[PDB]
Design brief:
The structure holds 2 protein chains of 2 kinds. Chain A is mostly beta strands. Chain A has strands spanning 2-7, 10-11, 17-24, 31-38, 45-50, 56-58, 66-71, 76-81, 90-102, 107-109, 121-125, 134-138, 146-156, 162-165, 174-176, 180-181, 187-196, 206-211, 216-221. Chain B has helices at residues 123-128, 184-187; strands at 5-8, 11-14, 20-30, 35-40, 47-50, 64-77, 87-92, 98-99, 103-107, 115-119, 130-140, 145-151, 154-155, 160-164, 174-183, 192-199, 206-211. The chains are: A mainly beta, B mainly beta. The A-B interface holds A 34, 43-46, 57, 59-60, 93, 95, 98, 111-115, 117-120, 134, 136-139, 141-142, 146, 148, 150, 152, 154, 175, 177-180, 182, 188-190, 192, 194, 225 and B 1-2, 34, 36, 38, 45-48, 51-52, 57, 89, 91, 93, 96-102, 115, 117, 119-122, 124-125, 128, 132, 134, 136, 138, 161-165, 175-177, 179, 181, 215. It is classed as immune system.
Chain lengths: 225, 215
């Protein structure tokens, strides 16, 4: 049994999020089928479940916003989440839940743990428009031995940006940090590298910043001030 | 009225070949054996590890086991393999499904103090009306480090954001950046911009600073 899922990616607040999961190698009638989300860097939150006859159970805090549906002929099931906000930004997973059983005196669904899982679909909810970053130098100061320098990649949307140094010829000692979501709704990150301080007068350091969503490419040379 | 699952500790720092033990406590009794465990590696979906408190689905090696009842459950890995360093979650299904907050198992190494660097905002950015001051903590262990921003001795609050790298695959250290953001007007009202770093690897807190407008 294998699961494939797809749907929207970027949405604006107040839109309706829609996703679909397709089941291969098995029938929907044997199980409950769930949606589970994970905000970036956060834990897991169960959203709701649906079975082949359309019966549903919901996370009580999300029940009023969730609509689940099943297409038994296609062996697919879907999630609709209405009136999205930035708080709904998350990787959404579909998953097979507990099986339907027929015991001598009882029938129903049991053992509602999750296996297997879909690969997950990142959904981003934001009112920001697509915007390329501004790139600013993080200049090296001035025995010692080791110096630090970098590039500040500020105010872009959406994710992601890639950073290389000297067109890929400098990799050792590089740290490109995860982006942070600023209060403005735009992302920002920095990429730093530590180098020998003796070579600052004869070595050149250029950060290559590429923002594919805005078709932006910026090369910034970082020199001591 | 959901069942709340609380895991402890939040982070385990261990080496391959050592035992890991994760606790999961519930705010209400979990009926029957209705508790599962999951493992999640970065960029992957969670993977069912234990079900029915103590059962392993096919393919889960027997170094993983589970125990408990009622409001108290335990996951244990008898001897850790390198692939076992990941985040682990408990989940109950006696009621509407809920998960624990996750427990990260990371690689234990010797204490390493951070090398600290402070970066003033560039002239170009100041022209646009914003000042970003960046503080860099490079290649430290353990991950727990405290960065405070002090502007002319005044402790800043609410105007900074942090970012931390994942544990390095080669030296098992972490790196962290803290960015203090002020408008150009606010930035020019002050002189001393200082980044104060507290970390177990330091005998006393390390402060890096610069005076605005000077070399």
């Amino acid at each position: 049994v294998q699961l494939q899922q797809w749907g929207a990616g970027l949405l604006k607040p107040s839109e309706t999020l829609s996703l679909t999961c397709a089941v291969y190698g098995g029938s929907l009638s044997g199980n409950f089928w769930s949606w589970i989300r994970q905000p970036p860097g956060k834990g897991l939150e169960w959203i709701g479940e649906i079975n082949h006859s359309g019966e549903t159970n919901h996370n009580p805090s999300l029940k009023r916003r969730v609509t689940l549906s099943v297409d038994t002929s296609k062996n697919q099931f879907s999630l609709k989440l209405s009136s999205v906000t930035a708080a709904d930004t998350a990787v959404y997973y579909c998953a097979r839940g507990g099986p339907k059983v027929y015991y001598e005196y009882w029938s129903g669904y049991v053992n509602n743990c999750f296996d297997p899982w879909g690969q997950g679909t990142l959904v981003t909810v934001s009112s920001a428009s697509t915007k390329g970053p501004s790139v600013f130098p993080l200049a090296p100061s001035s025995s010692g031995g080791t110096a630090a320098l970098g590039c500040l990649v500020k105010d872009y949307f959406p994710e992601p940006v890639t950073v290389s140094w000297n067109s890929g010829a400098l990799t050792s000692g590089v740290h490109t940090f995860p982006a942070v979501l600023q209060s403005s709704g735009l992302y920002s990150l920095s990429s730093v590298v530590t180098v020998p301080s003796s070579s600052l007068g004869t070595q050149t350091y250029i950060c290559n910043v590429n923002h594919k969503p805005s078709n932006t490419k910026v090369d910034k040379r970082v020199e001591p001030k | 009225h959901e069942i709340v699952l609380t895991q402890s500790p939040g982070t385990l720092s261990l080496s391959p070949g050592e035992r890991a033990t994760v606790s999961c406590r519930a705010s209400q009794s979990v009926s029957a054996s209705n508790l599962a465990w999951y493992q999640q590696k970065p960029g992957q979906a969670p993977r069912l590890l234990i079900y029915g408190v103590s059962s392993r689905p096919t393919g889960i090696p027997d170094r993983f086991s589970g125990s408990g009842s009622g409001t108290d459950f335990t996951l244990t890995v008898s001897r850790l393999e390198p692939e076992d360093f990941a985040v682990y979650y408990c989940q109950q299904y006696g009621s509407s499904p809920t998960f624990g907050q996750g427990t990260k198992v990371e690689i234990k190494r010797t204490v390493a103090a951070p090398s600290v660097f402070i970066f003033p905002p560039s002239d170009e950015q100041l022209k646009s009306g914003t000042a970003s001051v960046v503080c860099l903590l490079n290649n430290f262990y353990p991950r727990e480090a405290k960065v405070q921003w002090k502007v002319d001795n005044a402790l800043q609050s609410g105007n900074s954001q942090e970012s931390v790298t994942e544990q390095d695959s080669k030296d098992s250290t972490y790196s962290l950046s803290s960015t203090l953001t002020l408008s150009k007007a606010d930035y020019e009202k002050h002189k001393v911009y200082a980044c104060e770093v507290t970390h177990q690897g330091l005998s006393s807190p390390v402060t890096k600073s610069f005076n605005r407008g000077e070399c």
